[PDB]
């Protein structure tokens, strides 16, 4: 009955899955799909840009974390919690976490560890929803995400 968790896992897992496999899931999103569809479209636009602009930072972090199996995914959860340890929460940090998740998911697929992608998506969702639920709700959840990353075209 935790709709925020379900919706968050749907968006994050869909992005990690399509990034790792290179194939979009052509099923419609679950109900509340307008918001979820827009969020995944926004996440593609922003997340693809983050991975391209910051590939060097992402490759360096991946190389040092040495992610090989599902135990390393759990270790990554500890690190991800520290993304908010200074008391600051914003959508830039949240999308950076998800973007790195996609970056790692692509790595896991290349090393025949696709079974680790779903645990990775769940871990990212766990950190976001189980430790920053209150902030997410204040933003109107994924609607706030869509509206923040909406680039205004004002002629």
């Amino acid at each position: 009955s935790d709709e925020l968790y379900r919706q968050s896992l749907e968006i994050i897992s869909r992005y990690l899955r399509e990034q790792a496999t290179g194939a979009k899931d052509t099923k419609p999103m679950g109900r509340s799909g307008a918001t979820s569809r827009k969020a995944l479209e926004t996440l593609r636009r922003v997340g693809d840009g983050v991975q391209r602009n910051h590939e060097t930072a992402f490759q360096g972090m991946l190389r040092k974390l040495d992610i090989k199996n599902e135990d390393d995914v759990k270790s990554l959860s500890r690190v991800m919690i520290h993304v908010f340890s200074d008391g600051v929460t914003n959508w830039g940090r949240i999308v950076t976490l998800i973007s790195f998740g996609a970056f790692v998911a692509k790595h896991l697929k290349t090393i025949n560890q696709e079974s680790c992608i779903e645990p990775l998506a769940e871990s990212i969702t766990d950190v976001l929803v189980r430790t920053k639920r209150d902030w997410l709700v204040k933003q109107r959840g994924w609607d706030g995400f869509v509206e923040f990353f909406h680039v205004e075209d004002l002629e």
């Binding site: 690190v79 993304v83 959508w91 940090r93």
Partner: peptide, 21 residues
């Protein structure tokens, strides 16, 4: 976890980029 601040700073750069968008 020592790498944590790197993620925070990068995330803040991304937030700052879109905040003026």
């Amino acid at each position: 976890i020592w790498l944590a601040q790197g993620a925070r700073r990068l995330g803040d750069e991304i937030n700052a980029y879109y905040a003026r968008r």
